[PDB]
Amino acid sequence: METTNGTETWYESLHAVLKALNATLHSNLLCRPGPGLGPDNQTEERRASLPGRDDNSYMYILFVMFLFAVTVGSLILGYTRSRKVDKRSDPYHVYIKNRVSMI
Numbered sequence: 372m373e374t375t376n377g378t379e380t381w382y383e384s385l386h387a388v389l390k391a392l393n394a395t396l397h398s399n400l401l402c403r404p405g406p407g408l409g410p411d412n413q414t415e416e417r418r419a420s421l422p423g424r425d426d427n428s429y430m431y432i433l434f435v436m437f438l439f440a441v442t443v444g445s446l447i448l449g450y451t452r453s454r455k456v457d458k459r460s461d462p463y464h465v466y467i468k469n470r471v472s473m474i
Contacts, residue, residue, distance in 0.1 A: 459474070
């Protein structure tokens with residue numbers, strides 16, 4: 372003949388089954404996306420590692436050194452034509468001798 376549907380430890384083992392049932396419920400209700408959202412064959416990788424110098428990118432560099440002496444030209448004309456800043460004072464007025472000439 373069994374013990375009662377009525378002991379304190381029987382109620383505590385039902386209380387444990389209830390705490391687990393609340394866990395299975397919250398843990399389900401929060402809606403995490405499941406495993407295998409990306410490919411399971413999606414291997415580990417490295418970072419980006421962008422090109423280094425070679426012979427051909429060296430010879431573009433010798434032509435960059437060329438395009439640099441014409442960039443010296445394109446800088447002076449940079450001032451003459453890309454810069455559109457108005458004068459402070461007139462080309463002949465700036466040379467009036469009892470004050471400093473100021474471009």
